[PDB]
Amino acid sequence: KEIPEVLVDPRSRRRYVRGRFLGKGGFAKCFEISDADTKEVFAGKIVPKSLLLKPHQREKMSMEISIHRSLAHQHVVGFHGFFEDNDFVFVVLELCRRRSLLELHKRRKALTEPEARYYLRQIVLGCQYLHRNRVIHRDLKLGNLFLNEDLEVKIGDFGLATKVEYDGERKKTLCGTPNYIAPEVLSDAGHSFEVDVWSIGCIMYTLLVGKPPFETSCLKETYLRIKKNEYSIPKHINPVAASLIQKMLQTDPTARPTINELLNDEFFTSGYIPARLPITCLTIPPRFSIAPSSLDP
Amino acid sequence: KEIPEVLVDPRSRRRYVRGRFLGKGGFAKCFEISDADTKEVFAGKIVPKSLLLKPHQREKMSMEISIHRSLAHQHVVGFHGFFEDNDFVFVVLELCRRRSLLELHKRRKALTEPEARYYLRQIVLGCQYLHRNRVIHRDLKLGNLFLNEDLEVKIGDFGLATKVEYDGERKKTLCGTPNYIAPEVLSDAGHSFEVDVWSIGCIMYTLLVGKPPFETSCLKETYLRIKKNEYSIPKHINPVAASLIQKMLQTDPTARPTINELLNDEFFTSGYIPARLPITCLTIPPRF
Numbered sequence: 054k055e056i057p058e059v060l061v062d063p064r065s066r067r068r069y070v071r072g073r074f075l076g077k078g079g080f081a082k083c084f085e086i087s088d089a090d091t092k093e094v095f096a097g098k099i100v101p102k103s104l105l106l107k108p109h110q111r112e113k114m115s116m117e118i119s120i121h122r123s124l125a126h127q128h129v130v131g132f133h134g135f136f137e138d139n140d141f142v143f144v145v146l147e148l149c150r151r152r153s154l155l156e157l158h159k160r161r162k163a164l165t166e167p168e169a170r171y172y173l174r175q176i177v178l179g180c181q182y183l184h185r186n187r188v189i190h191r192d193l194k195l196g197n198l199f200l201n202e203d204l205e206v207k208i209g210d211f212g213l214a215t216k217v218e219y220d221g222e223r224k225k226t227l228c229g230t231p232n233y234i235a236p237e238v239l240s241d242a243g244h245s246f247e248v249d250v251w252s253i254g255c256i257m258y259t260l261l262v263g264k265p266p267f268e269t270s271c272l273k274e275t276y277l278r279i280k281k282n283e284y285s286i287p288k289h290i291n292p293v294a295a296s297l298i299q300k301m302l303q304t305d306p307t308a309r310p311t312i313n314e315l316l317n318d319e320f321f322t323s324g325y326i327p328a329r330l331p332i333t334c335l336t337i338p339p340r341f342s343i344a345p346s347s348l349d350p
Numbered sequence: 351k352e353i354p355e356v357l358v359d360p361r362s363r364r365r366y367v368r369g370r371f372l373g374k375g376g377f378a379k380c381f382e383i384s385d386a387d388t389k390e391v392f393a394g395k396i397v398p399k400s401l402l403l404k405p406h407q408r409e410k411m412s413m414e415i416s417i418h419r420s421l422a423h424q425h426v427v428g429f430h431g432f433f434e435d436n437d438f439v440f441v442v443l444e445l446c447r448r449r450s451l452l453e454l455h456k457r458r459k460a461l462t463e464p465e466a467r468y469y470l471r472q473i474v475l476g477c478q479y480l481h482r483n484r485v486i487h488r489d490l491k492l493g494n495l496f497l498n499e500d501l502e503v504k505i506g507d508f509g510l511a512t513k514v515e516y517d518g519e520r521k522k523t524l525c526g527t528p529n530y531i532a533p534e535v536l537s538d539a540g541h542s543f544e545v546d547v548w549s550i551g552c553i554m555y556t557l558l559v560g561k562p563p564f565e566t567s568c569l570k571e572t573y574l575r576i577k578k579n580e581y582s583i584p585k586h587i588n589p590v591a592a593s594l595i596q597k598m599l600q601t602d603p604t605a606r607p608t609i610n611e612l613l614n615d616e617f618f619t620s621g622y623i624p625a626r627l628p629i630t631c632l633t634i635p636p637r638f
């Protein structure tokens with residue numbers, strides 16, 4: 054079933070011209086799209102209804118839209134609306150012209166500590182906004198941490214996200230497999246907000262070390278390592294960073310920092326955070342003083 | 351830890367007394383040092399191994415030394431040897447007692463055309479030697495164009511330099527951000543020898559105009575201007591100089607002069623090149 058060259062909203066009468074193909078994942082494909090009248094450019098997520106027949110997939114797509122449309126934050130992908138033809142669901146999102154932390158990681162490998170700190174602070178602020186609105190994302194990974202023109206982080210892909218109905222509620226059901234499986238998800242013990250802190254721990258490790266903490270060549274060994282909390286931080290990682298990784302990557306979810314305590318860690322409060330990163334940082338390491346000072350042009 | 355007052359080579363048994371502090375950049379500090387027996391004076395580059403733990407920094411330091419120690423040219427900083435303690439790497443270099451073209455530019459701003467020509471010829475001869483030995487410097491800037499007692503140019507800081515392994519190899523990986531970002535570096539398209547001609551174009555512009563070609567108050571606008579080749583040569587620049595700048599500052603690396611063609615431009619062949627510059631030219635415009 055071919056995807057229309059022009060997307061028409063049956064209700065609001067708005068129409069979009071399908072531009073550049075941006076990427077695909079699971080049931081979904083994503084394109085650059087532009088309004089006819091305003092000429093404003095967005096990201097168009099496009100899902101065939103042929104893949105939404107299995108009732109677990111209908112509820113997945115439904116839940117993503119329900120959660121995402123309720124969110125508005127500087128560090129969360131803007132949600133502009135959704136509509137549907139007889140063959141497709143169309144979701145209009147904020148375009149992020151600098152791809153994702155996944156492409157950055159593939160190109161650069163290990164970032165400098167100030168770059169890691171710059172991105173992680175924004176990831177933490179976004180997740181703090183989610184948790185305050187009782188949303189667990191449950192699938193934070195480099196691939197759904199998008200970058201706009203100015204290299205601001207935008208959290209997207211709410212496909213596994215869930216709303217906590219009361220503070221204290223633990224969930225078991227997932228409609229898919231998260232990239233970073235927290236130990237309480239692997240063990241099916243019930244999970245809450247702490248799974249997001251686990252994934253941010255995995256992300257922090259990956260950005261600073263240049264490889265994932267647990268991932269091996271085979272899933273059996275990966276999952277045994279997560280179960281037994283078997284990972285190693287290289288000697289070259291600065292003690293304060295190493296310390297914060299150890300706090301987040303603990304088997305006991307209750308021993309992990311809350312998202313509010315994460316933001317207040319010595320890593321963030323006492324580490325150099327650049328106000329901006331130059332665009333060259335997508336491809337080449339920037340240069341920083343041993344201890345930078347705001348008392349210098 | 352603290353830096354030793356005397357530097358001892360464990361192998362060659364040579365020993366150096368740490369003199370005046372000359373300057374620092376990134377992980378490195380530089381001092382004036384003197385031999386015990388000859389009393390010959392050198393520049394001592396001194397890097398803590400504490401900063402070389404990250405394996406990308408170890409290989410950076412390693413590659414700089416590997417490339418630099420293979421070079422010997424009158425317009426390249428002399429490399430006299432290296433050794434290491436348990437806490438430090440020590441590199442013994444040719445001393446350049448008159449700092450760099452950066453300090454000259456800050457004091458003088460726009461140079462006279464014959465001064466610009468004098469420095470650029472030496473920069474081009476140095477780079478011609480590098481390219482012939484399959485070395486791309488990739489970070490030529492006023493700050494690593496050092497001046498000796500006689501204001502002869504010495505190219506140093508091979509920290510971003512790479513050796514071309516085979517004919518038509520294009521490079522992508524840089525272990526740092528060059529001062530002058532060539533458009534093929536910004537776009538991550540792959541680069542070779544032509545990035546050095548781009549940087550020499552930017553240097554020529556800066557020396558003659560007194561400001562950099564692309565640099566603005568915000569890096570976003572600077573990088574958009576490099577991408578779109580947006581720069582302006584003031585009317586007061588002599589046409590032959592203006593023409594040579596335009597040849598070097600082209601988006602297409604293949605459209606730029608090679609380092610060998612650079613030397614043969616009318617700018618060099620038909621312009622007055624002083625045999626030497628008097629020491630006053632560090633602070634006041636000379637008479638010609």
Ligand SMILES: CCN1C(=O)C(/C=N/c2ccnc(N(C)C3CCN(C)CC3)c2)=[SH]C/1=C(/C#N)C(=O)NCC(F)(F)F
Nearest residue numbers: 075076077078081082083096130146148149150152199209
């Ligand atoms: C947040 C909205 N969003 C974007 O803004 C995206 C933009 N990605 C970019 C940005 C700039 N360039 C590229 N390219 C790959 C270019 C292709 C042409 N080429 C010559 C240069 C690169 C891709 S992807 C996206 C998604 C979302 N949500 C999303 O991919 N979601 C997962 C899915 F699709 F599986 F559902």
Ligand SMILES: CCN1C(=O)C(/C=N/c2ccnc(N(C)C3CCN(C)CC3)c2)=[SH]C/1=C(/C#N)C(=O)NCC(F)(F)F
Nearest residue numbers: 372373374375378379380393427445446447448449496506
């Ligand atoms: C080529 C060898 N070499 C020198 O010969 C250098 C000599 N610089 C001079 C000559 C004469 N006077 C002065 N000063 C006036 C001083 C400036 C500062 N200030 C506080 C005291 C005095 C500094 S610096 C150098 C370097 C090299 N290589 C180098 O700076 N490399 C980059 C680095 F270090 F960051 F790694």
Ligand SMILES: [Cl-]
Nearest residue numbers: 265266267268
């Ligand atoms: Cl992992």
